[PDB]
Amino acid sequence: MNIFEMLRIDEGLRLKIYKDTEGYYTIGIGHLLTKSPSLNAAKSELDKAIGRNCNGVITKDEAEKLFNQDVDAAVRGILRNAKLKPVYDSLDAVRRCALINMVFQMGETGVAGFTNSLRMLQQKRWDEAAVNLAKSRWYNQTPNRAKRVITTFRTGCWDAYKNL
């Protein structure tokens, strides 16, 4: 398993504009288009992102292209962030994937806000960190996905996803 397969399981693939769990306009593999309420504003963002008139619909290929850009951007953002980089560097390969998944979902800023959990991960206190991470809106709002990620940080293995 790898970061791409993990995220594909968590986000799904949709070729038509859709609303995410938070009600925002998204397309592809979890690519947020806009937090604005206008489908029009979304269709516009979409055409700007793809470089064609899409009329709210994209191909598999286009979806995958956006996905590659997003994963790349999530990684570079962690590497550039003063709070995130040290954590990421301290982690093994599997756990690194778990941090990337949170950043892709919630943005750099959002994850950087998990001060206490970050400290615990750095210290390698797996059980403590899993408990602390669960005390968040994140976990209450998307519990199945949060459990999968949390289990990944807890064990350092891909079990949570070898089901799926």
CSV table of N, CA and C in Angstrom, one decimal:
chain,number,residue,atom,x,y,z
A,1,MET,N,0.8,-1.1,0.0
A,1,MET,CA,0.0,0.0,0.0
A,1,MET,C,0.9,1.2,0.0
A,2,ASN,N,0.4,2.3,-0.5
A,2,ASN,CA,1.1,3.6,-0.6
A,2,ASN,C,0.2,4.7,-0.4
A,3,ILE,N,0.7,5.9,-0.3
A,3,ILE,CA,0.0,7.2,-0.1
A,3,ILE,C,-1.2,7.3,-1.1
A,4,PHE,N,-0.9,7.1,-2.3
A,4,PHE,CA,-1.9,7.2,-3.3
A,4,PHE,C,-3.1,6.2,-3.2
A,5,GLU,N,-2.8,5.0,-2.9
A,5,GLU,CA,-3.9,4.0,-2.7
A,5,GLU,C,-4.6,4.3,-1.4
A,6,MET,N,-3.9,4.7,-0.4
A,6,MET,CA,-4.6,5.1,0.9
A,6,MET,C,-5.6,6.2,0.6
A,7,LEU,N,-5.1,7.3,0.1
A,7,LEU,CA,-6.0,8.4,-0.2
A,7,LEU,C,-7.1,8.1,-1.2
A,8,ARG,N,-6.9,7.2,-2.1
A,8,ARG,CA,-8.0,6.9,-3.0
A,8,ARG,C,-9.1,6.1,-2.2
A,9,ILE,N,-8.7,5.4,-1.2
A,9,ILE,CA,-9.7,4.6,-0.4
A,9,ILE,C,-10.5,5.6,0.4
A,10,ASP,N,-9.8,6.6,1.0
A,10,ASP,CA,-10.5,7.6,1.8
A,10,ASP,C,-11.4,8.6,1.2
A,11,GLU,N,-11.0,9.1,0.0
A,11,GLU,CA,-11.7,10.1,-0.7
A,11,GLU,C,-12.6,9.6,-1.8
A,12,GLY,N,-12.3,8.4,-2.4
A,12,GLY,CA,-13.2,8.0,-3.5
A,12,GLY,C,-12.8,8.7,-4.8
A,13,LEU,N,-13.5,8.4,-5.9
A,13,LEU,CA,-13.3,9.1,-7.1
A,13,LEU,C,-14.6,9.5,-7.7
A,14,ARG,N,-14.8,10.8,-8.0
A,14,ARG,CA,-16.1,11.2,-8.6
A,14,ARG,C,-15.7,12.1,-9.8
A,15,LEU,N,-16.3,11.9,-10.9
A,15,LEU,CA,-16.0,12.6,-12.1
A,15,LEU,C,-16.9,13.8,-12.4
A,16,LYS,N,-17.9,14.0,-11.5
A,16,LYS,CA,-18.9,15.1,-11.6
A,16,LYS,C,-18.8,16.0,-10.4
A,17,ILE,N,-18.9,17.4,-10.4
A,17,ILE,CA,-18.8,18.2,-9.2
A,17,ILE,C,-19.8,17.6,-8.2
A,18,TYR,N,-19.3,17.5,-7.0
A,18,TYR,CA,-20.1,17.0,-5.9
A,18,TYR,C,-19.8,17.8,-4.6
A,19,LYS,N,-20.6,17.6,-3.6
A,19,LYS,CA,-20.4,18.3,-2.3
A,19,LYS,C,-19.7,17.4,-1.3
A,20,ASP,N,-18.7,17.8,-0.7
A,20,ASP,CA,-18.0,17.0,0.3
A,20,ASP,C,-18.8,16.9,1.6
A,21,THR,N,-18.1,16.2,2.5
A,21,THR,CA,-18.8,16.0,3.8
A,21,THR,C,-19.2,17.3,4.4
A,22,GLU,N,-18.4,18.4,4.2
A,22,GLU,CA,-18.7,19.7,4.8
A,22,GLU,C,-19.6,20.6,4.0
A,23,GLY,N,-20.1,20.1,2.9
A,23,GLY,CA,-20.9,20.7,1.9
A,23,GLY,C,-20.2,21.5,0.9
A,24,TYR,N,-18.9,21.3,0.8
A,24,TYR,CA,-18.2,22.1,-0.3
A,24,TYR,C,-18.0,21.4,-1.6
A,25,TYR,N,-18.0,22.3,-2.6
A,25,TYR,CA,-17.9,21.8,-4.0
A,25,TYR,C,-16.4,21.2,-4.3
A,26,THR,N,-16.4,19.9,-4.7
A,26,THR,CA,-15.2,19.1,-4.9
A,26,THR,C,-15.4,18.3,-6.2
A,27,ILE,N,-14.4,17.8,-6.7
A,27,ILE,CA,-14.4,16.9,-7.8
A,27,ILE,C,-13.2,15.9,-7.7
A,28,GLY,N,-13.2,14.9,-8.5
A,28,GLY,CA,-12.1,13.9,-8.5
A,28,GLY,C,-11.9,13.1,-7.3
A,29,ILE,N,-10.6,13.1,-6.9
A,29,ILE,CA,-10.2,12.5,-5.6
A,29,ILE,C,-10.0,13.5,-4.5
A,30,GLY,N,-11.1,14.0,-4.0
A,30,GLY,CA,-11.0,14.9,-2.9
A,30,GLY,C,-10.4,16.3,-3.2
A,31,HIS,N,-10.5,16.7,-4.5
A,31,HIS,CA,-10.0,18.0,-4.8
A,31,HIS,C,-11.0,19.1,-4.5
A,32,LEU,N,-10.8,19.9,-3.4
A,32,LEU,CA,-11.7,21.0,-3.1
A,32,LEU,C,-11.7,22.1,-4.2
A,33,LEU,N,-12.8,22.5,-4.6
A,33,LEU,CA,-12.8,23.6,-5.6
A,33,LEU,C,-13.0,24.9,-5.0
A,34,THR,N,-14.0,25.1,-4.2
A,34,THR,CA,-14.3,26.4,-3.5
A,34,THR,C,-15.1,26.2,-2.2
A,35,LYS,N,-15.0,27.0,-1.3
A,35,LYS,CA,-15.8,26.9,-0.1
A,35,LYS,C,-17.1,27.8,-0.4
A,36,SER,N,-17.1,28.5,-1.5
A,36,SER,CA,-18.3,29.3,-1.9
A,36,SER,C,-19.5,28.5,-2.3
A,37,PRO,N,-20.7,29.0,-2.0
A,37,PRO,CA,-21.9,28.4,-2.2
A,37,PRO,C,-22.4,28.3,-3.7
A,38,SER,N,-21.7,29.0,-4.5
A,38,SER,CA,-22.2,29.1,-5.9
A,38,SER,C,-21.6,28.0,-6.8
A,39,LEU,N,-22.5,27.2,-7.4
A,39,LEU,CA,-22.1,26.1,-8.3
A,39,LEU,C,-21.4,26.7,-9.4
A,40,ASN,N,-21.7,28.0,-9.6
A,40,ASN,CA,-21.1,28.7,-10.7
A,40,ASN,C,-19.7,29.1,-10.4
A,41,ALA,N,-19.4,29.5,-9.2
A,41,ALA,CA,-18.1,29.8,-8.7
A,41,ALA,C,-17.3,28.5,-8.8
A,42,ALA,N,-17.9,27.4,-8.5
A,42,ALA,CA,-17.2,26.1,-8.6
A,42,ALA,C,-16.9,25.7,-10.0
A,43,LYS,N,-17.8,25.9,-10.9
A,43,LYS,CA,-17.6,25.5,-12.3
A,43,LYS,C,-16.5,26.3,-12.9
A,44,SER,N,-16.4,27.5,-12.4
A,44,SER,CA,-15.3,28.4,-12.8
A,44,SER,C,-13.9,28.0,-12.3
A,45,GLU,N,-13.9,27.6,-11.1
A,45,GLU,CA,-12.7,27.2,-10.5
A,45,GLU,C,-12.2,25.9,-11.2
A,46,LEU,N,-13.2,25.1,-11.5
A,46,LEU,CA,-12.9,23.8,-12.2
A,46,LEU,C,-12.2,24.1,-13.6
A,47,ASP,N,-12.8,25.0,-14.4
A,47,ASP,CA,-12.3,25.2,-15.7
A,47,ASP,C,-10.9,25.8,-15.6
A,48,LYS,N,-10.6,26.6,-14.6
A,48,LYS,CA,-9.4,27.3,-14.3
A,48,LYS,C,-8.3,26.2,-13.9
A,49,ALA,N,-8.8,25.2,-13.1
A,49,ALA,CA,-7.9,24.1,-12.7
A,49,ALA,C,-7.5,23.2,-13.8
A,50,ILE,N,-8.4,22.9,-14.8
A,50,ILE,CA,-8.2,21.9,-15.8
A,50,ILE,C,-7.6,22.5,-17.1
A,51,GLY,N,-8.0,23.8,-17.3
A,51,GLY,CA,-7.5,24.5,-18.5
A,51,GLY,C,-8.4,24.3,-19.7
A,52,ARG,N,-9.7,23.9,-19.5
A,52,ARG,CA,-10.7,23.6,-20.5
A,52,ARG,C,-12.1,23.9,-20.0
A,53,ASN,N,-13.0,24.0,-20.9
A,53,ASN,CA,-14.4,24.2,-20.5
A,53,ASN,C,-15.0,22.9,-20.0
A,54,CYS,N,-15.2,22.7,-18.8
A,54,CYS,CA,-15.5,21.3,-18.5
A,54,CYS,C,-17.0,21.0,-18.4
A,55,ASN,N,-17.7,22.1,-18.1
A,55,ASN,CA,-19.1,22.0,-17.8
A,55,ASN,C,-19.3,21.1,-16.6
A,56,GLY,N,-18.5,21.2,-15.6
A,56,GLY,CA,-18.7,20.4,-14.4
A,56,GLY,C,-18.4,18.9,-14.4
A,57,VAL,N,-17.8,18.5,-15.5
A,57,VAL,CA,-17.4,17.1,-15.6
A,57,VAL,C,-15.9,17.0,-16.1
A,58,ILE,N,-15.2,16.0,-15.6
A,58,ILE,CA,-13.8,15.7,-16.0
A,58,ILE,C,-13.7,14.2,-16.3
A,59,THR,N,-12.5,13.8,-16.9
A,59,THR,CA,-12.1,12.5,-17.2
A,59,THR,C,-11.3,11.9,-16.1
A,60,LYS,N,-11.1,10.5,-16.1
A,60,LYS,CA,-10.3,9.8,-15.2
A,60,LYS,C,-8.9,10.4,-15.1
A,61,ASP,N,-8.3,10.6,-16.2
A,61,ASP,CA,-7.0,11.2,-16.4
A,61,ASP,C,-6.8,12.5,-15.8
A,62,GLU,N,-7.8,13.4,-15.9
A,62,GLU,CA,-7.8,14.8,-15.3
A,62,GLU,C,-7.9,14.6,-13.8
A,63,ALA,N,-8.7,13.7,-13.4
A,63,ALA,CA,-8.9,13.5,-11.9
A,63,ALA,C,-7.5,13.1,-11.3
A,64,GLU,N,-6.8,12.2,-12.0
A,64,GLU,CA,-5.6,11.7,-11.6
A,64,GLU,C,-4.5,12.7,-11.6
A,65,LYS,N,-4.6,13.6,-12.6
A,65,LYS,CA,-3.6,14.7,-12.6
A,65,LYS,C,-3.7,15.6,-11.4
A,66,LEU,N,-4.9,16.0,-11.1
A,66,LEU,CA,-5.2,16.9,-10.0
A,66,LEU,C,-4.7,16.2,-8.7
A,67,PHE,N,-4.9,14.8,-8.6
A,67,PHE,CA,-4.5,14.1,-7.5
A,67,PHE,C,-3.0,14.1,-7.3
A,68,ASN,N,-2.3,13.9,-8.3
A,68,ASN,CA,-0.8,14.0,-8.3
A,68,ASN,C,-0.4,15.3,-7.8
A,69,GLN,N,-1.0,16.4,-8.3
A,69,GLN,CA,-0.6,17.8,-7.9
A,69,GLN,C,-0.9,18.0,-6.4
A,70,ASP,N,-2.0,17.5,-6.0
A,70,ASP,CA,-2.4,17.7,-4.6
A,70,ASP,C,-1.6,17.0,-3.5
A,71,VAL,N,-1.2,15.7,-3.9
A,71,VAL,CA,-0.3,14.9,-3.0
A,71,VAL,C,1.1,15.6,-2.9
A,72,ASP,N,1.6,16.0,-4.0
A,72,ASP,CA,2.9,16.7,-4.1
A,72,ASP,C,2.9,18.0,-3.3
A,73,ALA,N,1.8,18.7,-3.5
A,73,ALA,CA,1.6,20.0,-2.7
A,73,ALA,C,1.5,19.7,-1.2
A,74,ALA,N,0.8,18.6,-0.8
A,74,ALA,CA,0.7,18.3,0.6
A,74,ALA,C,2.1,18.0,1.2
A,75,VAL,N,2.9,17.1,0.5
A,75,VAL,CA,4.2,16.8,1.0
A,75,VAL,C,5.1,18.1,1.1
A,76,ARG,N,5.2,18.9,0.1
A,76,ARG,CA,6.0,20.2,0.0
A,76,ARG,C,5.5,21.1,1.1
A,77,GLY,N,4.3,21.1,1.4
A,77,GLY,CA,3.8,21.9,2.5
A,77,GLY,C,4.3,21.5,3.8
A,78,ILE,N,4.3,20.2,4.1
A,78,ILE,CA,4.8,19.6,5.3
A,78,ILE,C,6.3,20.0,5.5
A,79,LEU,N,7.0,19.9,4.4
A,79,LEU,CA,8.4,20.1,4.4
A,79,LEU,C,8.8,21.5,4.6
A,80,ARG,N,7.9,22.5,4.3
A,80,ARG,CA,8.1,23.9,4.4
A,80,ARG,C,7.5,24.4,5.7
A,81,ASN,N,6.8,23.6,6.5
A,81,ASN,CA,6.2,24.1,7.6
A,81,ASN,C,7.0,23.8,8.9
A,82,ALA,N,7.3,24.9,9.6
A,82,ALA,CA,8.2,24.7,10.8
A,82,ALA,C,7.7,23.8,11.9
A,83,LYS,N,6.4,23.7,12.0
A,83,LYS,CA,5.9,22.8,13.0
A,83,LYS,C,5.7,21.4,12.5
A,84,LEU,N,5.5,21.2,11.2
A,84,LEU,CA,5.3,19.9,10.6
A,84,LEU,C,6.5,19.1,10.2
A,85,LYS,N,7.5,19.7,9.7
A,85,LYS,CA,8.7,19.1,9.2
A,85,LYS,C,9.5,18.3,10.2
A,86,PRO,N,9.6,18.8,11.4
A,86,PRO,CA,10.3,18.0,12.5
A,86,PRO,C,9.6,16.7,12.8
A,87,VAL,N,8.2,16.8,12.8
A,87,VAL,CA,7.5,15.6,13.1
A,87,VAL,C,7.7,14.6,12.0
A,88,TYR,N,7.4,15.0,10.8
A,88,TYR,CA,7.6,14.2,9.6
A,88,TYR,C,8.9,13.5,9.5
A,89,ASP,N,10.0,14.3,9.8
A,89,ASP,CA,11.3,13.7,9.7
A,89,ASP,C,11.5,12.7,10.8
A,90,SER,N,10.8,12.8,11.9
A,90,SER,CA,11.0,11.8,13.0
A,90,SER,C,10.3,10.5,12.7
A,91,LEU,N,9.4,10.5,11.8
A,91,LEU,CA,8.6,9.3,11.6
A,91,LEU,C,9.1,8.2,10.6
A,92,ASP,N,8.6,7.0,10.8
A,92,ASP,CA,8.8,5.9,9.9
A,92,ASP,C,8.0,6.1,8.6
A,93,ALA,N,8.2,5.3,7.6
A,93,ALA,CA,7.5,5.5,6.3
A,93,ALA,C,6.0,5.3,6.3
A,94,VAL,N,5.5,4.4,7.1
A,94,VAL,CA,4.0,4.2,7.2
A,94,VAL,C,3.4,5.4,7.9
A,95,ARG,N,3.9,5.8,9.0
A,95,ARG,CA,3.3,6.9,9.8
A,95,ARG,C,3.4,8.2,9.0
A,96,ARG,N,4.4,8.3,8.2
A,96,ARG,CA,4.5,9.5,7.4
A,96,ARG,C,3.3,9.6,6.5
A,97,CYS,N,2.8,8.5,6.0
A,97,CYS,CA,1.6,8.5,5.1
A,97,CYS,C,0.4,9.0,5.9
A,98,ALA,N,0.3,8.6,7.2
A,98,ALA,CA,-0.8,9.1,8.0
A,98,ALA,C,-0.8,10.6,8.2
A,99,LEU,N,0.4,11.2,8.3
A,99,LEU,CA,0.5,12.7,8.4
A,99,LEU,C,0.1,13.3,7.1
A,100,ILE,N,0.5,12.7,6.0
A,100,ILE,CA,0.2,13.3,4.7
A,100,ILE,C,-1.3,13.3,4.5
A,101,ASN,N,-2.0,12.2,4.8
A,101,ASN,CA,-3.4,12.0,4.7
A,101,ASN,C,-4.1,13.2,5.5
A,102,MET,N,-3.8,13.4,6.8
A,102,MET,CA,-4.4,14.5,7.6
A,102,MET,C,-4.2,15.9,6.9
A,103,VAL,N,-3.0,16.2,6.4
A,103,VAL,CA,-2.7,17.4,5.7
A,103,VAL,C,-3.5,17.6,4.4
A,104,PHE,N,-3.7,16.5,3.6
A,104,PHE,CA,-4.5,16.5,2.4
A,104,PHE,C,-6.0,16.9,2.8
A,105,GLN,N,-6.5,16.3,3.8
A,105,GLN,CA,-7.8,16.5,4.2
A,105,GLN,C,-8.1,17.8,4.8
A,106,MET,N,-7.3,18.2,5.7
A,106,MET,CA,-7.5,19.4,6.5
A,106,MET,C,-6.6,20.6,6.3
A,107,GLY,N,-5.6,20.5,5.4
A,107,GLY,CA,-4.7,21.6,5.2
A,107,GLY,C,-3.6,21.7,6.3
A,108,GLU,N,-2.5,22.3,6.0
A,108,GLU,CA,-1.3,22.5,6.8
A,108,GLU,C,-1.6,23.2,8.1
A,109,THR,N,-2.3,24.2,8.0
A,109,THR,CA,-2.7,25.0,9.1
A,109,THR,C,-3.5,24.3,10.1
A,110,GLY,N,-4.5,23.6,9.6
A,110,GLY,CA,-5.3,22.8,10.4
A,110,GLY,C,-4.6,21.7,11.2
A,111,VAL,N,-3.7,21.0,10.6
A,111,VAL,CA,-2.9,20.0,11.3
A,111,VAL,C,-2.0,20.6,12.3
A,112,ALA,N,-1.3,21.7,11.8
A,112,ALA,CA,-0.3,22.3,12.6
A,112,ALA,C,-0.9,22.8,14.0
A,113,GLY,N,-2.2,22.9,14.0
A,113,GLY,CA,-3.0,23.3,15.2
A,113,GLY,C,-3.1,22.2,16.2
A,114,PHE,N,-2.8,20.9,15.8
A,114,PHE,CA,-2.8,19.8,16.7
A,114,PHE,C,-1.5,19.7,17.6
A,115,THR,N,-1.1,20.8,18.2
A,115,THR,CA,0.1,20.9,19.0
A,115,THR,C,0.4,19.7,19.8
A,116,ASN,N,-0.5,19.4,20.7
A,116,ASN,CA,-0.2,18.3,21.7
A,116,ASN,C,0.0,16.9,21.0
A,117,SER,N,-0.9,16.5,20.0
A,117,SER,CA,-0.8,15.3,19.3
A,117,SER,C,0.6,15.2,18.6
A,118,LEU,N,1.0,16.3,18.0
A,118,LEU,CA,2.2,16.4,17.2
A,118,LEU,C,3.5,16.1,18.1
A,119,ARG,N,3.4,16.6,19.3
A,119,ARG,CA,4.5,16.5,20.3
A,119,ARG,C,4.5,15.0,20.7
A,120,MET,N,3.4,14.4,21.0
A,120,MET,CA,3.3,13.0,21.3
A,120,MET,C,3.8,12.1,20.1
A,121,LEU,N,3.5,12.4,18.9
A,121,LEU,CA,4.0,11.6,17.8
A,121,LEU,C,5.5,11.7,17.8
A,122,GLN,N,6.1,12.9,17.9
A,122,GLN,CA,7.5,13.1,17.9
A,122,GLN,C,8.2,12.3,19.0
A,123,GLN,N,7.5,12.2,20.1
A,123,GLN,CA,8.1,11.5,21.2
A,123,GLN,C,7.8,10.1,21.0
A,124,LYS,N,7.1,9.6,19.9
A,124,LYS,CA,6.8,8.2,19.8
A,124,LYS,C,5.9,7.6,20.9
A,125,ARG,N,5.0,8.3,21.4
A,125,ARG,CA,4.1,7.8,22.4
A,125,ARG,C,2.8,7.5,21.6
A,126,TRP,N,2.8,6.4,20.9
A,126,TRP,CA,1.7,6.0,20.0
A,126,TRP,C,0.3,5.9,20.6
A,127,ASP,N,0.1,5.2,21.7
A,127,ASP,CA,-1.1,5.1,22.4
A,127,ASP,C,-1.6,6.4,22.9
A,128,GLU,N,-0.7,7.2,23.4
A,128,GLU,CA,-1.1,8.5,23.9
A,128,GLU,C,-1.6,9.4,22.8
A,129,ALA,N,-0.8,9.4,21.8
A,129,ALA,CA,-1.2,10.3,20.7
A,129,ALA,C,-2.6,9.9,20.0
A,130,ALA,N,-2.9,8.6,19.9
A,130,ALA,CA,-4.1,8.1,19.3
A,130,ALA,C,-5.3,8.5,20.1
A,131,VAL,N,-5.2,8.5,21.4
A,131,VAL,CA,-6.2,9.0,22.3
A,131,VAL,C,-6.4,10.5,22.2
A,132,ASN,N,-5.3,11.3,22.2
A,132,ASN,CA,-5.4,12.7,22.0
A,132,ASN,C,-6.0,13.1,20.6
A,133,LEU,N,-5.6,12.5,19.6
A,133,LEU,CA,-6.1,12.8,18.2
A,133,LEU,C,-7.7,12.7,18.1
A,134,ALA,N,-8.2,11.7,18.8
A,134,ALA,CA,-9.7,11.3,18.8
A,134,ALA,C,-10.5,12.4,19.5
A,135,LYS,N,-9.9,13.3,20.2
A,135,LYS,CA,-10.6,14.4,20.9
A,135,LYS,C,-10.5,15.6,20.0
A,136,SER,N,-11.2,15.5,18.9
A,136,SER,CA,-11.2,16.6,17.9
A,136,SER,C,-12.5,16.7,17.1
A,137,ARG,N,-12.8,17.8,16.6
A,137,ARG,CA,-14.0,17.9,15.7
A,137,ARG,C,-13.8,16.9,14.5
A,138,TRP,N,-12.5,16.8,14.0
A,138,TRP,CA,-12.2,15.9,12.9
A,138,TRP,C,-12.7,14.5,13.1
A,139,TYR,N,-12.4,13.9,14.3
A,139,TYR,CA,-12.8,12.6,14.7
A,139,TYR,C,-14.3,12.5,14.8
A,140,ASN,N,-14.9,13.5,15.4
A,140,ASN,CA,-16.4,13.5,15.6
A,140,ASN,C,-17.2,13.6,14.2
A,141,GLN,N,-16.7,14.4,13.3
A,141,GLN,CA,-17.3,14.6,12.0
A,141,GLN,C,-17.0,13.4,11.0
A,142,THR,N,-15.8,12.9,10.9
A,142,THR,CA,-15.6,11.8,10.0
A,142,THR,C,-14.9,10.7,10.7
A,143,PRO,N,-15.6,10.0,11.7
A,143,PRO,CA,-15.1,9.0,12.5
A,143,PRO,C,-14.5,7.8,11.8
A,144,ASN,N,-15.1,7.2,10.7
A,144,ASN,CA,-14.5,6.0,10.1
A,144,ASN,C,-13.1,6.3,9.5
A,145,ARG,N,-13.0,7.4,8.7
A,145,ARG,CA,-11.8,7.8,8.2
A,145,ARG,C,-10.7,8.2,9.3
A,146,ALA,N,-11.2,9.0,10.3
A,146,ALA,CA,-10.3,9.3,11.4
A,146,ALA,C,-9.7,8.0,12.1
A,147,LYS,N,-10.6,7.0,12.3
A,147,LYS,CA,-10.1,5.8,13.0
A,147,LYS,C,-9.1,5.1,12.2
A,148,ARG,N,-9.2,5.1,10.9
A,148,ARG,CA,-8.3,4.5,10.0
A,148,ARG,C,-6.9,5.1,10.1
A,149,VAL,N,-6.9,6.4,10.1
A,149,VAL,CA,-5.7,7.2,10.2
A,149,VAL,C,-5.0,7.1,11.6
A,150,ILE,N,-5.8,7.1,12.5
A,150,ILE,CA,-5.4,7.0,13.9
A,150,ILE,C,-4.8,5.6,14.1
A,151,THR,N,-5.4,4.6,13.6
A,151,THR,CA,-4.9,3.2,13.7
A,151,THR,C,-3.5,3.1,13.0
A,152,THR,N,-3.4,3.8,11.9
A,152,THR,CA,-2.1,3.8,11.2
A,152,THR,C,-1.0,4.4,12.0
A,153,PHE,N,-1.3,5.5,12.8
A,153,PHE,CA,-0.3,6.1,13.7
A,153,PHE,C,0.0,5.3,14.9
A,154,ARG,N,-1.0,4.6,15.4
A,154,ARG,CA,-0.9,3.7,16.5
A,154,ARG,C,0.0,2.5,16.2
A,155,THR,N,-0.2,1.9,15.1
A,155,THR,CA,0.5,0.7,14.8
A,155,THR,C,1.7,0.7,13.9
A,156,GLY,N,1.7,1.7,13.0
A,156,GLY,CA,2.7,1.8,12.1
A,156,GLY,C,2.7,0.7,11.0
A,157,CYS,N,1.5,0.1,10.8
A,157,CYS,CA,1.2,-1.0,9.9
A,157,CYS,C,-0.1,-0.5,9.1
A,158,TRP,N,-0.4,-1.2,8.0
A,158,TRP,CA,-1.5,-0.9,7.1
A,158,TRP,C,-2.8,-1.7,7.3
A,159,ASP,N,-2.9,-2.3,8.5
A,159,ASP,CA,-4.1,-3.1,8.7
A,159,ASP,C,-5.4,-2.4,8.5
A,160,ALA,N,-5.6,-1.2,8.9
A,160,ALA,CA,-6.9,-0.4,8.8
A,160,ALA,C,-7.4,-0.3,7.4
A,161,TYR,N,-6.4,-0.5,6.5
A,161,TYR,CA,-6.8,-0.3,5.1
A,161,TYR,C,-6.7,-1.7,4.3
A,162,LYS,N,-6.3,-2.8,5.0
A,162,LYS,CA,-6.2,-4.0,4.2
A,162,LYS,C,-7.4,-4.9,4.2
A,163,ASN,N,-8.4,-4.3,4.8
A,163,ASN,CA,-9.7,-4.7,4.9
A,163,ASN,C,-10.5,-4.3,3.6
A,164,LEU,N,-10.3,-3.0,3.3
A,164,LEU,CA,-10.9,-2.0,2.4
A,164,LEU,C,-10.6,-2.0,0.9
